[PDB]
Each structure stands twice: as structure tokens, then as C-alpha cells.
Design a protein around this ligand. Structure first.
Ligand SMILES: [Ca+2]
Length: 842
């Protein structure tokens, strides 16, 4: 009893977390039985495990012997009936065996680990006590208490949950009713940063300013700054951040002054709710959101299996813009449009394949490397099939619409041109040719008003989409020479069974600048795929003409249904003959002052832009310098210019954590990180070193292309230090879970950064200069909080007080040790020390 008791009650003598004890705590006894033979004075070296001498109750002390008796090849176990006098010799005999064996392996590392193992067999100490699970992607979350006496350094006056755009004020906005929900939820993955905390808000701003000045700050090269941002996971953070970022863009860059300034820094949100667009629009169009309705329209009218496909009309009317006749010089609301992204309609399809053909109980997207590579074999083959079971149909049809549509900036996804897996840019998809063709055509032909028509012919239907030519917003505008040699027509059908009757005609009005004119093909579907024409000359054979009225006319000879690996339906695209090799109908943004109170205007100059999402989650890791993405990017900067890419959306560049607790930290895309400022600085990121990054930003600038920084304020992964928090089990809205055991109960999280990383170096480092240069930013009272940001304290080190909570860690409800008698946590704070009766007073 005696020797074992604690050496001294100092914090010094125990391994503790915020002065609390855990099941895995080691400490300094007064003596060590040396080689289980002789009672020698401890030194600051002789640390043992608590569990070696103390148990939270007798039932646990029992298991421990049984378990331990196993390990030490002691051949005796005890069932529930056992006295405690035997439970007490059982552990003393083990204790000798423990020293004897430490002497023998000259170490205790092996113990560290028999201990750690055992701890995990107990309910109070594993994920058993953390049930019931909920539908958080990592199975559950813990909300940290704002007011706990036990964990005062984790207290917060904030932690205001769920203030999405729709719900920013804590009530659902009456203004936006397309989404009838509250438009998002707080807890998405990992450690959830509390973005309602004014100090944290200021820190998000610091980081924004940093990214946007990355060149100057890191390389001293004004030519290497990110030009613009994406706000990630908008519907999972506090929407004040939208005001802050827009306020910034305004103050620092002048985006509200004129279009040229707004388009040099054109920024986007990833905001899934239908409410978010009108919300953004009332906010002043300081950034643009995706057109989610059009995305769904493409997906269901074009990309789904033949039996699940819907009719085509939504391709015209289910959108931010009704494209039946779109003749506005400036659209009501700006947006960007896409059909796939790094996550959307890619990692889903892999999940579909794993869940179907590999591991049926796979959770969320928590995949393994193994499963994935296995998944990819199936997927890649499905890509080449005519009958697809897992992957998109009609990719080229979707791009034809996206790249010819008026009133939205198209975003092309990397993985629709290159293989989603695979070294960067090494392999082309079968659609690369058609997409590149469309991209090139867009620069040269795509300008003017738009008309879309849905026509029931033969046994099915087609839609026709028409751009009138540069300088004709309406069908009746005759324009000038360049109008005449610009414009385009797209014809599409979504049913392989489409047959026209002999008497059918599809009559397309091309616009008044196009009477009696030659047209030639750009893309035509063929039995095996799609044939691309790279020049008039190339398509010399297949010319057709409009008539007196400027109508093209199409017939059964032109239009029928196909099924091949690229087309399930019909695609045809025609362009006028005679465009100068170097014709370009894009249009530069005006310096004329903006006057409608909005920053971004969806006009012809904005339509002239094209966005490129330049990565895939599932890219292979580089084998060598040459294969690093950012290296490869700098080296093909010309292609991007040739495609008319004006905004290059780089992947997040933060060094990835490697915990594997979610997809993002398995394929290391850059959304899972521990250091916000570590852009390939401490070691390379998936995409190269900080220098490769700097070089790729420079390369893209040299072509005049803009580069977007993914701004990811929602969460952080794998913090290095432990902290104790008062936690509660909650669902993703922060509501307490029914039937859980963790309710204002102490928990051990990984919630502290190292205080020695880049964050330590740059955190809050620019606040002072920001307040001098842009006092207006700090004057705003943020919506959710009612108060201004708080730059008066810098964040050099993240700790739990800056977080809402975390995903569940499997440590258990009882990990932090409590005297079950008094039901009170043990503590090592000095004026109030409380230890287990046996270790201090035996
Ligand atoms: Ca959040």
C-alpha cells in the first residue's frame, strides 16, 4: 500500500491533462520494486501506470487482473464472485512480473501498451459509452460547455450554432423560402471552429488577408498572391464570415467600384441551400454562388441511367436563369455552373461502388486506400462502357450546355477532362477532345442573346440552344461583321430511341445576322462517339445553310438517337463558317463606376470568364518532383490559356493531416489540415512545395489567369495537444443526443495546436495593419453576434475555447477519472487537490 502511494501530490508527479487524471495516466510512486525484488527510491525516471495500483472500482480492477494475468503468462482467472483480498494480491503479483520484465527488456514501452490495450477493452473507456450514434459523418459530435467550473479555460460566451445564411439571426429568414429548412447545420467534420467568436472571426480575416497576400508575405513576390477565394462549407459555418470576406474584398480590392476590379478577384461560395443565392444577392453580390438547380437539371435530364432520366425542359427553365429567351445585357443574379466537382458526383459514385461491391457497411465517406483503389477498377471500366452502371451519361451534352449557356460562369471540372485517379494530367478522359473543342469554340463563337427551345419530335423530344453572335442580344438584332461570324447552335436529345419521321423538321432560328449563311459542324455524334471538327476546312464536307429567315433546318438525316460510351441520346453543334483564325468574342470588363450597389454583374464580360476546378480528390500521389501538380501546372499554363480558363481554382494548399479519420485525410486533398498557414511550408503538400506553389501562381499570372485560394474556416484536424473540456453528445445541429451518457461530462480532446507552427508565426500578425488601413471592417457589428470582430487578441495557438466541439473520439464517457464514492473528478490543481484515497492516504 505504502510504497505505491504517490511520491508527492505535485502536478509534477503525474501525467495529467489540464490537472485531471485519465485511464492512461502514469505517475511517480515513492519506490519501484526493482526487478520485483527490492524497494528502491524512485527517481524522476521511474514513472508507473495508475492502473497498476488503482482501479475506478472493483469490477474494473477485476478485468484488469484477468487481462493482465493472460499477458504475463500467469495461469489464473477470477470470476465475479471474487473477494477483494485476492483481487489485491493478483495485482501485486503482476507488479513484480512487471518490474522483472522491465529490467529484462530494459524498458517500460511494452507496458505503456499492454496498458493502452486493456483500457480499450472497457466500456467507460471506448466508444461504447459514446452511443447512440447519429448521422454526423464521423458518427457524432461533442459540444463544449460555455460555462464550466471544471474547465474554465474552455469557457466561451459564444458558440452560437447553426447561423447559416438562412438562419444567421437565430430565426429562419422570412425572405427566402425555396429551402424550407434552416439551410445547413453546424457540425460537419473534425474540430469545429466557432466562427461566431469575435476573436476567431478576426483570425479568419487575418488568414484571408494572408492568402490573398501570400506572395508578398511568404516570398516577397507581389506576383505570387492568390487573387480570389472560395468559401468552403458555407452552410456549416456562421454566415458573418460572408460579411467579413466581402467587406474585405471591398476595402482591400475595390470590387464594388467597377467590374474590372470585381472580375480581377472574382470569388465564390460553396453554398448548397437554395436560399443562399438570393441571400448573397441581397448582400450585394460580393461573391457568386453555384446554380444548384441547373446542376440538378443536367444531372437528371442528361447524366442519369436511361430509366431514371427526366424530360428535358428543366434544362431550359430549372435554373437561376430561365433560358427560353435570355436577352438581358446583365442577368438578374450572377452564378457559376457545373455538373461535377471534386466532391460532388465523384466521391459519391465511389461510395456507391464500395457500398454495392466491396464493403456493404461502409460509413459516410470514411473509406480506406484499399477499398478506393479497388473501387477505381470497376469505375474506370464503367467510364468506357455504353451501358453505365455507376458513372455519368452524356458528359459532352452537359458541357455543351454549360459552355454555351448565357448568364453564368461555367466551371469545368479537372476530372472530366483527365482521369479522376492517376498522376496529374497524365491521362485524358474520352471526352477530353469534345470538351477542349467546346472550350476553344466558346472563345471564338459564344456571345450574344440566347434562345432555348424544347420540341416534341418523332417519338421523343429535342432541345435547341442558340447564341445569336457578338452584338445581338435579340433575335431581331442584325449586328455587324463579327455578329455574322459568331453564335452557335446546340441540339440535344436524351433518349437513344429517338427517331424522326420522314416529314419532321427541327427549324432553329439563328438570329437576324444569319440569313443565307453557311454553317459547319463543331461536334457530331457518331456510332461510336462524337466526332470533333477543329476547323472549317476539316468540316468542309458537311456544310449546311440557313434560309431567308436565318433558320437552320434539321431532319431525320441529321438527328437520331444513339447509344455509345459518350452519348445516350443525340448531340449536334454547329457554328458559322468564316471566323478568322484568331477571332475572339470575349469582352473585357469596364472601368466605368458601378452604380446599382452590387459588386459582381453577370454581363458579357463576366460571361467571358471560365472557371477551372484544377484538381481531383483521387489523384495519385506524385512519384517524383516532375509529377507534382503545381509543377505540372506551371508547365502547361498555355493549355489553360488556350481553353479560355480565366480563373483557376487551386485545391486547398494546406499540408494535409494524415489521421485517415475521413476521406480528405486519406487522399490528402488539403481540406483536412492542422496548420492553416502551412501551405507546403514545413513539408510538401500533395501538390508540391511552397516554392512549387509560388511558381504555379506566377506561371498562371504570366498568362493573365487568376488564381483562387480555397478558404476553409469550418474545421481543423488532428490537433497535437490534449485538453479537457466539459462536453455533451450532440447531433449535427448541436442538439443533445437522446439516451447518451455524455452530458456536461469531462472529456479529453485533441484540441491544442503546437504553438510552434506557422499558425504561431502568422496568427493575428496583420490585424494591426488591417485596422489602420481598413477601419471600416472593424466597425461592422456582425449579424449573428451583434458586436464587431475582436482583433484585440491574437490566435497563436488554437485551444478548445475557439471551437464548438469535435467529432467523437472513442475515448469514452469515463476516461477522466472520478471517485465513484463522491462522484467527483480527481484533480491536481494545488489549492484544491483531490486524489484517490489509496494513493495519498494508505
Ligand atoms: Ca461549423
Amino acid at each position: 500500500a505504502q510504497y505505491n502511494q504517490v511520491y508527492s501530490t505535485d502536478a509534477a508527479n503525474f501525467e495529467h491533462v489540464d490537472h485531471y487524471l485519465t485511464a492512461e495516466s502514469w505517475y511517480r510512486p515513492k519506490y519501484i520494486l526493482k526487478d520485483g525484488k527490492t524497494w528502491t527510491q524512485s527517481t524522476e525516471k521511474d514513472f508507473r501506470p495508475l492502473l497498476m495500483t488503482w482501479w475506478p472500482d472493483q469490477e474494473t480492477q477485476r478485468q484488469y487482473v484477468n487481462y493482465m494475468n493472460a499477458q504475463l503468462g500467469i495461469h489464473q482467472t477470477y470470476n465475479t464472485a471474487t473477494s477483494p483480498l485476492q483481487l489485491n494480491l493478483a495485482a501485486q503479483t503482476i507488479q513484480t512480473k512487471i518490474e522483472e520484465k522491465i529490467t529484462a527488456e530494459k524498458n517500460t514501452n511494452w507496458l505503456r501498451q499492454t496498458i493502452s490495450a486493456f483500457v480499450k477493452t472497457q466500456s467507460a473507456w471506448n466508444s461504447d459509452s459514446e452511443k447512440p450514434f447519429d448521422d454526423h459523418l464521423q458518427k457524432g459530435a461533442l459540444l463544449y460547455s460555455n460555462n464550466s467550473k471544471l474547465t474554465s479555460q474552455a469557457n466561451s460566451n459564444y458558440r452560437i450554432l447553426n447561423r447559416t445564411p438562412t438562419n444567421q439571426t437565430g430565426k429562419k429568414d422570412p425572405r427566402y423560402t425555396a429551402d424550407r429548412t434552416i439551410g445547413g447545420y453546424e457540425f460537419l467534420l473534425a474540430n469545429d471552429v466557432d466562427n461566431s467568436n469575435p476573436v476567431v472571426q478576426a483570425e479568419q480575416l487575418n488568414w484571408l488577408h494572408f492568402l490573398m497576400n501570400f506572395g508578398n508575405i511568404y516570398a516577397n513576390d507581389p506576383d505570387a498572391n492568390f487573387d480570389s477565394i472560395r468559401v468552403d462549407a458555407v452552410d456549416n459555418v456562421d454566415a458573418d464570415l460572408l460579411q467579413i470576406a466581402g467587406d474585405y474584398l471591398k476595402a482591400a480590392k475595390g470590387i464594388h467600384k467597377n467590374d474590372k476590379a470585381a472580375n480581377d478577384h472574382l470569388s465564390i461560395l460553396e453554398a448548397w441551400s437554395y436560399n443562399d443565392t438570393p441571400y448573397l444577392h441581397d448582400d450585394g453580390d460580393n461573391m457568386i454562388n453555384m446554380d444548384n438547380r441547373l446542376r440538378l437539371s443536367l444531372l437528371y435530364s442528361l447524366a442519369k441511367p436511361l430509366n431514371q432520366r427526366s424530360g428535358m425542359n428543366p434544362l431550359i427553365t430549372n435554373s437561376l436563369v430561365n433560358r427560353t429567351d435570355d436577352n438581358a445585357e446583365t442577368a438578374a443574379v450572377p452564378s457559376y455552373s457545373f455538373i461535377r466537382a471534386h466532391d460532388s458526383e465523384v466521391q459519391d459514385l465511389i461510395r456507391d461502388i464500395i457500398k454495392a461491391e466491396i464493403n456493404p457497411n461502409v460509413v459516410g465517406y470514411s473509406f480506406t486506400m484499399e477499398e478506393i483503389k479497388k473501387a477505381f477498377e470497376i469505375y474506370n471500366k464503367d467510364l468506357l462502357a455504353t451501358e453505365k452502371k455507376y458513372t455519368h451519361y452524356n458528359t459532352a451534352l452537359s458541357y455543351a450546355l454549360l459552355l454555351t449557356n448565357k448568364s453564368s460562369v461555367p466551371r469545368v471540372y479537372y476530372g472530366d477532362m483527365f482521369t479522376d485517379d492517376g498522376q496529374y494530367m497524365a491521362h485524358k478522359t474520352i471526352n477530353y477532345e469534345a470538351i477542349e473543342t467546346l472550350l476553344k469554340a466558346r472563345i471564338k463563337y459564344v456571345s450574344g442573346g440566347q434562345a432555348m427551345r424544347n420540341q416534341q419530335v418523332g417519338n421523343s423530344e429535342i432541345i435547341t440552344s442558340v447564341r445569336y453572335g457578338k452584338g445581338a442580344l435579340k433575335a431581331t438584332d442584325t449586328g455587324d461583321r463579327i455578329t455574322r461570324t459568331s453564335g452557335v447552335v446546340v441540339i440535344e436529345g436524351n433518349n437513344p430511341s429517338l427517331r424522326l419521321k420522314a416529314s419532321d423538321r427541327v427549324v432553329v432560328n439563328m438570329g437576324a445576322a444569319h440569313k443565307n449563311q453557311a454553317y459547319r459542324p463543331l461536334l457530331l455524334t457518331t456510332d461510336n462517339g462524337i466526332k470533333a471538327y477543329h476547323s472549317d476546312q476539316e468540316a468542309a464536307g458537311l456544310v449546311r445553310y440557313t434560309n431567308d429567315r436565318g433558320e437552320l433546318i434539321f431532319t431525320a438525316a441529321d438527328i437520331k438517337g444513339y447509344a455509345n460510351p459518350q452519348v445516350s441520346g443525340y448531340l449536334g453543334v454547329w457554328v458559322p463558317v468564316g471566323a478568322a483564325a484568331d477571332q475572339d468574342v470575349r469582352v473585357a470588363a469596364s472601368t466605368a463606376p458601378s452604380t446599382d450597389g452590387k459588386s459582381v454583374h453577370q454581363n458579357a464580360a463576366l460571361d467571358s470568364r471560365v472557371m477551372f476546378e484544377g484538381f481531383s480528390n483521387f489523384q495519385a500521389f506524385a512519384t517524383k518532383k516532375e509529377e507534382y501538380t503545381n509543377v505540372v501546372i506551371a508547365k502547361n499554363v498555355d493549355k489553360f490559356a488556350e481553353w479560355g480558363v480565366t480563373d483557376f481554382e487551386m485545391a486547398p494548399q494546406y499540408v494535409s493531416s494524415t489521421d485517415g479519420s475521413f476521406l480528405d485525410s486519406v487522399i490528402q486533398n488539403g481540406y483536412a489540415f492542422t496548420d492553416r498557414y502551412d501551405l507546403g511550408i514545413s513539408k510538401p503538400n500533395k501538390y508540391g512545395t511552397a516554392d512549387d506553389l509560388v511558381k504555379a501562381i506566377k506561371a498562371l499570372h504570366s498568362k493573365g489567369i487568376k488564381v483562387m485560394a480555397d478558404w476553409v474556416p469550418d474545421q481543423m484536424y488532428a490537433l497535437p495537444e490534449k485538453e479537457v473540456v466539459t462536453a455533451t453528445r450532440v447531433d449535427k445541429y448541436g442538439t443533445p443526443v437522446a439516451g447518451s451518457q455524455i452530458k456536461n461530462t469531462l472529456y479529453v480532446v485533441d484540441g491544442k495546436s503546437s504553438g510552434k507552427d506557422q499558425q504561431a508565426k502568422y496568427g493575428g500578425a496583420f490585424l494591426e495593419e488591417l485596422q489602420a488601413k481598413y477601419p471600416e471592417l472593424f466597425a461592422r457589428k456582425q449579424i449573428s453576434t451583434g458586436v464587431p470582430m475582436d482583433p484585440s487578441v491574437k490566435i497563436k495557438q488554437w485551444s478548445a475555447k475557439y471551437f464548438n466541439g469535435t467529432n467523437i473520439l472513442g475515448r469514452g464517457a469515463g476516461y477522466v477519472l472520478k471517485d465513484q464514492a463522491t462522484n467527483t473528478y480527481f484533480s491536481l490543481v494545488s489549492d484544491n487537490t483531490f486524489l484517490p484515497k489509496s494513493l495519498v492516504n494508505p
